[PDB]
């Protein structure tokens, strides 16, 4: 999709005054271009613009028509957003203007840019900054313009940044506006850095005089950068970018260049003498001098120091080396003090950058630095300590940065000991030995060993212990260690092959390689346990086969023998050989290796062997044989007749697979086969119309017969009483067929169409799949029925569809608890194919198929609502028969299901949708009032159990309906209604006293709360914080007589707090969390007051939930220690409740700190961490 080009209206006459009816000039081309809609021919005419100007290189003075043409071009360019490719298109086009026309274009485009820079609308600033950004990249027209307007562009940037800061500090309270303003700040700062880096004017001094307007604008920009760096209510991206900019400007603006490294050093050490810096620096960077800057400020300043200075070639010299060491010292000092998660991630990135800079310096450094940067230095010791402490951090970015740091440390040592005699350095050997002492479940061991392998070569690691490959293979039966083991082994054998092809130059080396890496693999493939086989096949074997495909010939010959000897005996190694052979052959075929041979080989596979594999007892062997037949490297390779027969044989038996993973793999491979048939049928058709092989028309007939028979088998598999797996597989494969062969409908030829094979009876069975007790089957049947063409009333007469509607209405009011799901699916089907009866038009008062589905939904919802209103009134009268005859939750479920399918944001009959929503809310509240007293209290030919079922199911349905209605983006929903919904959720979920309405209300409340966060209305997005405060000050003075209950782990209050805390944007700001944890930790602390037990109880009940929620996740770490203290200090309290709550909270804390259990029983060392990690993460617990 592209955006149509537009133009200024008053320019028309301007371009009309030079246009011509004949159309010789460029002006007529502009007329033709602007009056278009397709953004494609415009591009063509844009290319032809250049020859038109080229064909007038004789006048010697620019034609006024050409002047106006280029002026309009410039105006259009400056009005084009960066999301429009046409902008880059005409940028590239005008890049090729003839040399005769350059000066006038220069001057006039300069004028246009200058008048652009004088804008004063606050919200138009971003467009201007984007324009300045564009004029820098590969656009010679704008580069000279901006080079001529440094003063003006700098002034604009400065004033825009100031105004954006003022607006942001003024728009406090609304966070969407604030986010937009932060983005504007960020683009402004980045553009300023681009300008300073990429303008051929800042070189030389030439402007450092105090009177230069450029100098004064630069000083003002520097002051703004310092002010925004020291600020703390802005996004951390803004502050980090500001630090980068500060260092860049200081490097640029400081006349005694050789003193730059020293000065910066002092700024980092907070030891700058206010009496020796130049006056402009003190004026602009007063915060940098005279102390008192945050730790974030120093972090971002040293980041900018590493990023924005020339470390290569030794330009900065000894002062540069001293600055490097000082930055290392400052970073290590900050490492122990920083505790915010995001700041920890930033520090990891900066440490990795420090290692890069050390690499660059160390490539030409002085001998003095070598001693201080080698592997035995103190700095490298601290870096290794950091790595060992952090390779298993929960945050992925932390771990990746630690891997980078470790690799760079090894490179640093290599550079320092270049005066080396024999390859194995003592430092490397010691590191390797120390790493080999770790257990094999330590994930950092694998990555560190991989880096070491690439440093010293795998021959030494093998010399230390030559059973390491087997040891690594033995852990490959544990998923979540498989990727690490696979990567380590791959690194190992790549290095080993490179080492063997060294000085010993022959062909026999491969033998040794094989016996090191393939023989253990074959043993595992033939005789390992099931999980080990599956994981080795899925993760490791493809890597080995891809790296060395000529090893396949070696493996097959070994396996084939073991197969044939089996027939000699009429052993386990001879028993697992077939599965291993099929796995190897599947991998080889799918990668196009030497086995790409037209029915999978001439002799590797026989009919007997394939049939044995396809029906083998082990799921893995069946899957590997199916994959050998189904998937190929070439996506249009012909399916042979043998493969079709084998696939039919396979389908006959493998539709009832019990493992969901196995079933899913089977369905995916079959879909791949159908895609191959579809794609090769087009090739066959093309050859057929192009008037050894078998006359492609024969193959097309074979394809048609094969697909028809496959459909026959799949529809036979839908017999009465068929299993859940067989219906799942049949419906999945049928849907895959419907999707794959629905491709060439814009095309001319299609080999197969599922719709042709659908009789009336097959349609009946597909609809009857709506009665299955499993919702997956209902969903699959619904999707497949919707994918078919000419189905709605083609297969059904009016009377039988009316019967179906009556049946759905009857199922919506049945006492069986799950019939309402079937009724909902039936009703949705009738709606989405316009098969409703005609009488339903009597409910509303009067092609866009969205409009007709909306009308159908409205009619059915109104019918359901009328029934529901009557039933709710009768339930108010007497709840017994309501539970017996017409439980009300079925209609609510059907209404919610109907609404769920719509796009609530894009309704079109709001005049009709408003009263219905009002009535819906009213009836929801009425029904909830009717059935709730039965659910908090006890019971008030109808057993009490079915009364309770009716009541709590109605509770659940009403909660889900309210959560659905909350997504109307309050309009159809007024603010009063949203407040009433929130009040309803608060009345429950805090007074339920029973398990019902704790997790019942939580889901609806979470939906409402997320919507409330995303809402742009300010009055609404302040609701969550206000509710949080209300419940917190309710907690403090709990007064045990209240309706809140202590049992069931709490009175739902943890659910309320969790839902409110969920509103916080993911990783965005998390300010509610800080307040809540401060208050709860304070409450849970020891209390002199005896009456203060209950506020201390609820806190420990809430805290527990907060420490196991997945959303809070890594934001909750800075509180763990405090919470831990509370739990422990709460274990010694005389009161029983405080101790019990402490126990539960402590359990949650243990799980959060040490992680989830890795295996069922042994827990050898899988959930332990070293003392160094534990007391670095929580140093206040030691």
């Amino acid at each position: 999709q592209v955006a149509a080009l537009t133009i200024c209206h008053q320019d028309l006459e301007t371009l009309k005054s030079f246009a011509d009816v004949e159309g010789k000039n460029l002006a007529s081309l502009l007329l033709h271009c602007v009056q278009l809609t397709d953004g494609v021919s415009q591009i063509h005419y844009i290319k032809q613009i250049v020859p038109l100007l080229e064909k007038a290189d004789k006048n010697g003075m620019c034609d006024p028509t050409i002047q106006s043409c280029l002026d309009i071009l410039a105006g259009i360019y400056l009005s084009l957003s960066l999301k429009n490719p046409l902008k880059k298109v005409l940028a590239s086009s005008l890049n090729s203007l003839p040399d005769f026309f350059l000066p006038e274009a220069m001057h006039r485009f300069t004028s246009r840019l200058q008048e652009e820079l004088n804008t004063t609308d606050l919200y138009s600033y971003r467009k201007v900054t984007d324009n300045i950004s564009s004029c820098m990249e590969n656009f010679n027209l704008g580069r000279a313009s901006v080079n001529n307007l440094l003063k003006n562009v700098l002034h604009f940037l400065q004033k825009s940044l100031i105004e954006i800061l003022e607006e942001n500090r003024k728009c406090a309270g609304n966070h969407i506006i604030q986010t937009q303003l932060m983005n504007d700040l960020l683009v402004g700062i980045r553009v300023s850095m681009m300008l300073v880096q990429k303008v051929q004017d800042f070189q030389g001094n030439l402007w450092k005089t105090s009177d230069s307007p450029i100098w004064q604008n630069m000083c003002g920009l520097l002051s703004i950068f310092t002010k925004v760096l020291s600020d703390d209510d802005l996004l951390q991206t803004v502050q980090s970018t500001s630090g980068l900019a500060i260092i860049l400007f200081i490097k640029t603006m400081f006349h005694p260049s050789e003193k730059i490294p020293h000065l910066i050093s002092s700024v980092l050490l907070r030891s700058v003498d206010c009496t020796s810096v130049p006056e402009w620096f003190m004026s602009s960077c007063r915060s940098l001098c005279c102390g008192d800057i945050s730790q974030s400020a120093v972090l971002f300043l040293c980041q900018g120091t590493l990023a924005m200075l020339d470390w290569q070639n030794g330009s900065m010299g000894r002062s540069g080396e001293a600055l490097l060491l000082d930055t290392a010292h400052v970073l290590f000092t900050l490492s122990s003090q920083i505790k915010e998660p995001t700041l920890e991630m930033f520090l990891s990135r900066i440490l990795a950058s420090w290692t890069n800079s050390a690499i660059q310096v160390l490539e030409s450094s002085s001998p003095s630095l070598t001693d201080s940067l080698n592997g035995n230095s103190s700095i490298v010791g601290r870096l290794l300590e950091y790595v060992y402490t952090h390779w298993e951090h929960p945050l992925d970015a932390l771990r990746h940065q630690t891997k980078i740091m470790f690799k760079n440390l090894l490179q640093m040592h290599r550079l320092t000991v270049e005066g080396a005699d024999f390859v194995p350095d003592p430092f490397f050997v010691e590191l390797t030995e120390s790493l080999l002492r770790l257990e094999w479940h330590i994930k950092g061991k694998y990555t560190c060993l991989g880096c070491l392998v690439e440093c010293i070569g795998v021959e030494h690691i093998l010399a230390i212990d030559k059973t390491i490959p087997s040891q690594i293979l033995e852990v490959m039966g544990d998923q979540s260690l498989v990727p690490y083991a696979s990567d380590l082994l791959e690194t190992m054998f790549r290095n080993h092959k490179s080492h063997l092809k060294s000085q010993t130059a022959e062909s026999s080396w491969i033998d040794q390689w094989h016996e090191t890496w393939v023989s253990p693999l074959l043993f595992i493939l033939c005789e390992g346990n099931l999980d080990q086989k599956s994981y080795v096949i899925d993760y490791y074997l493809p890597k080995l086969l891809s790296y060395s495909p000529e090893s396949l010939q070696y493996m097959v010959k070994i396996l084939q023998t073991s197969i044939d000897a089996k027939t000699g005996q009429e052993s386990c190694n001879s028993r697992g050989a077939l599965g291993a052979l099929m796995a190897c052959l599947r991998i080889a075929r799918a990668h196009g290796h030497l086995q790409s041979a037209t029915d999978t080989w001439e002799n590797l596979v026989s009919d007997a062997r394939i049939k044995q594999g396809l029906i083998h007892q082990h799921c893995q062997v069946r899957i590997d044989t199916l994959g050998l037949l189904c998937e190929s490297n070439r996506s249009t390779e012909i399916v042979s007749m043998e493969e079709m027969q084998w696939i039919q044989f396979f389908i006959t038996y493998n539709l009832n697979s019990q493992s969901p993973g196995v079933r899913q793999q089977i369905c995916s491979l079959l879909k791949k086969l159908f895609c191959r048939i579809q794609e090769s049928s087009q090739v066959l058709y093309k050859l057929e119309q192009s008037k050894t092989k078998q006359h492609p028309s024969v193959s097309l007939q074979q394809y048609k017969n094969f697909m028809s028979s496959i459909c026959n088998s799949l529809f036979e598999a839908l017999f009465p009483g068929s299993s859940y797996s067989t219906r799942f597989s049949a419906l999945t494969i049928l849907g895959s067929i419907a999707e794959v062969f629905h491709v060439p409908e814009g095309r001319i030829y299609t080999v197969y169409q599922l719709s042709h094979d659908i009789d009336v009876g097959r349609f009946q069975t597909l609809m009857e799949c709506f009665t299955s007790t499993f919702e997956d089957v209902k969903i699959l049947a619904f999707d497949l029925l919707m994918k078919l063409s000419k189905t709605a009333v083609h297969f059904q007469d009016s009377g039988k569809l009316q019967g179906l509607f009556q049946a759905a209405l009857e199922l919506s009011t049945s006492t069986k608890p799950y019939d309402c799901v079937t009724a909902s699916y039936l009703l949705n089907f009738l709606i989405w194919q316009d098969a409703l009866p005609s009488s339903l038009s009597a409910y509303l008062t009067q092609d866009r198929p969205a409009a007709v589905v909306e009308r159908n939904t409205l009619m059915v919802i109104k019918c359901l609502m009328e029934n529901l209103e009557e039933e709710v009134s009768q339930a108010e009268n007497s709840l017994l028969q309501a539970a017996a005859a017409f439980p009300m939750y079925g209609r609510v479920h059907c209404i919610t299901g109907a609404l769920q399918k719509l796009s609530l944001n894009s309704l079109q009959l709001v005049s009709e949708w408003r009263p219905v929503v009002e009535k819906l809310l009213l009836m929801s509240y009425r029904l909830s009032t009717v059935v709730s007293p039965v659910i908090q209290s006890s019971s008030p030919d109808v057993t009490a159990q079915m009364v309770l079922v009716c009541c709590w199911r109605s509770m659940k349905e009403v909660a889900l309906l309210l959560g659905m209605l909350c997504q109307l983006l309050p309009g159809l929903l007024t603010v009063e209604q949203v407040k009433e919904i929130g009040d309803y959720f608060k009345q429950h979920l805090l007074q339920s006293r029973h398990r019902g309405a704790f997790e019942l209300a939580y889901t609806g409340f979470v939906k409402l709360t997320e919507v409330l966060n995303r809402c742009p209305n300010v009055s609404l997005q302040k609701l969550p914080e206000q509710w949080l405060w209300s419940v917190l000050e309710e907690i403090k003075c709990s007064d045990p007589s209240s309706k809140l209950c202590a049992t069931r782990r709490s009175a739902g209050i943890p659910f309320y707090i969790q839902a409110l805390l969920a509103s916080e944007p993911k990783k965005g700001r998390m300010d509610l969390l800080k307040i809540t944890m401060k208050e709860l930790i304070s409450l849970a602390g020891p209390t002199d007051d005896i009456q203060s037990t209950v506020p201390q109880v609820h806190a420990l009940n809430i805290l527990r939930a907060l420490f196991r929620d997945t959303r809070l996740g890594e934001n909750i770490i800075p509180y763990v220690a405090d919470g831990a203290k509370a739990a422990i200090l709460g274990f010694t309290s005389p009161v029983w409740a405080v101790r019990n709550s402490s126990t539960l909270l402590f359990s949650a804390l243990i799980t959060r700190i040490f992680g989830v259990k890795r295996a069922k029983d042994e827990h050898s060392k899988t959930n332990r961490m070293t003392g160094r990690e534990f007391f670095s993460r929580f140093p206040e617990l030691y």
């Binding site: 006890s938 019971s939 159990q945 029983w1136 126990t1143 359990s1147 949650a1148 243990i1150 799980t1151």
Partner: protein
């Protein structure tokens, strides 16, 4: 599983009922029981089983107690309270002057957290309270069934229970989840110590309250 369904299909308030029945057909708990005490019955499924298997005679008396409220049953008297508290113990024992209960069952468990050591700790506390109630109520040679959490170390609990009972057996019925570490200690033949009132007591009671061996300690070398 299947018993979660069968609880709803039949007249059982919870799946736990099927754990009690499957412990009869393998230990014959309801041989001649006439009065029984039910500890920690949340909905009352065990109380229901006892009422239908003992109170079906008509004279069967059943006392159920829990931290929460229960729906009343015909032939069972309900008490809400913490059996750890002494007041609840007293009001429970208040029901058994003269004729003592023939059977005491305890289905209690803390809020099971997932890591098993804390579960053993809390279950040990609950079992100590239940054992106190039992020894204070049931007739000698009686029966005591109690839910336990079989973790890595279960020898201490078996040692403590063996002192008060002739036979102690550990059983896991079919209805118990196979992934769960719960189990049931069935205690046959209540055989209280001779000098024990709710010599030998000085050694037993400290050891049953906790693994206290500060009764064999001596200030002089041991006799040979």
């Amino acid at each position: 599983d299947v018993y979660y369904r069968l609880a709803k299909e039949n007249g059982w308030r919870a799946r736990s009922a099927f754990k009690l029945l499957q412990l009869d057909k393998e230990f014959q708990l309801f041989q001649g029981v006439t009065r029984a005490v039910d500890l920690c019955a949340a909905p009352g499924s065990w109380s229901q089983v006892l009422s239908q298997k003992i109170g079906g005679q008509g004279s069967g008396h059943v006392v159920a107690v829990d931290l929460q409220a229960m729906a009343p049953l015909p032939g069972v008297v309900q008490i809400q309270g913490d059996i750890t508290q002494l007041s609840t113990a007293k009001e429970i024992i208040q029901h058994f002057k003269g004729c003592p209960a023939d059977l005491v069952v305890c289905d209690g468990a803390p809020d099971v957290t997932g890591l098993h050591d804390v579960d053993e700790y809390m279950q040990a506390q609950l079992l100590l309270a239940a054992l106190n109630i039992a020894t204070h109520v049931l007739k000698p040679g009686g029966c005591f069934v109690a839910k336990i959490f079989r973790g890595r170390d279960v020898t201490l609990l078996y040692s403590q229970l063996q002192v008060f009972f002739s036979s102690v057996l550990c059983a896991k019925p079919r209805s118990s989840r196979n992934s769960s570490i719960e189990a049931f200690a069935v205690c046959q033949g209540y055989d209280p110590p001779e000098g024990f009132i709710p010599g030998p007591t000085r050694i037993i009671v400290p050891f049953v309250t906790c693994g206290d061996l500060s009764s064999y300690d001596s200030d002089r070398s041991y006799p040979l």
